[PDB]
């Protein structure tokens, strides 16, 4: 499955964790809060996100929602000589 690294890391940590992320990232990008073009919420939302980022809120939310998720030989491998 080709998906975003964030969802990938989250899933690869969840039980039964029978999935694994392979290789590096195919590119670099980011999630943004959207607003209708010409919206009155455009500027306040931008400043809110800058404030949240500069205050460590986004890092804490990410850490809380992602990181906190977290012999003897048998007859099967010697059956050849018995056959």
């Amino acid at each position: 499955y080709l998906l975003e690294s964030t969802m990938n890391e989250y899933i690869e940590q969840r039980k039964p964790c029978d999935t694994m992320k392979v290789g590096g990232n195919l590119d670099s990008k980011g999630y943004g809060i959207a607003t209708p073009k010409g919206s009155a919420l455009r500027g306040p939302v931008n400043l809110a996100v800058l404030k949240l980022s500069e205050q460590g809120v986004l890092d804490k939310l990410k850490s809380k929602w992602w990181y906190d998720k977290g012999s003897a030989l048998s007859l099967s491998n010697v059956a050849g000589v018995f056959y």
């Binding site: 969802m7 989250y10 899933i11 969840r14 929602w65 992602w66 998720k69």
Partner: peptide, 19 residues
């Protein structure tokens, strides 16, 4: 009050156990 449109996607938006 206006609507913040969203989507269901773990771990961004989840319905609480016994929603």
């Amino acid at each position: 009050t206006y609507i913040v449109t969203t989507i269901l996607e773990d771990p961004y938006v989840m319905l609480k156990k016994n929603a």
